[PDB]
Amino acid sequence: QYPIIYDIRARPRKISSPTGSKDLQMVNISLRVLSRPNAQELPSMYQRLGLDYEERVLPSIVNEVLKSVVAKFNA
Amino acid sequence: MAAKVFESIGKFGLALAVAGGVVNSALYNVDAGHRAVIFDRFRGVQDIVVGEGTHFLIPWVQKPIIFD
Secondary structure (H helix, E strand, C coil): CCCCCCCCCCCCEEEEEEEECCCCCEEEEEEEECCCCCCCCHHHHHHHHCCCCHHHCHHHHHHHHHHHHHHHCCC | CHHHHHHHHHHHHHHHHHHHHHHHHCCCCCCCCCCCEEECCCCCEEEEECCCCCCCCCCCCCCCCCCC
């Protein structure tokens, strides 16, 4: 059993994205997100995602969401 | 009598050391999330997996393939 101490205490993160807005204006928009892990399905967390899990998740989703919504929204 | 006892002790120790070496070589630590495989020549590689434990190979034919 390797229960390497999985720190559920908050470890913050921030992500930005340069997007072609509605007017094709290259608008760089930031976004600060507050993420915390769970306890009910940590087995899969460490088995698959290993020790480092938050590093493996946020950037792509944040970037895509920002790009989509900013392209939807005028400056 | 003592010499015979010492000789037997040495022989037993030598055999034990050989066995330990063999078992360790047939082992790859399946570090957390290291599903290796067992591998031979008669069939290639057994279509069965070494799960995320230190499931074991027979030596030198399974050159430890530790698929992380």
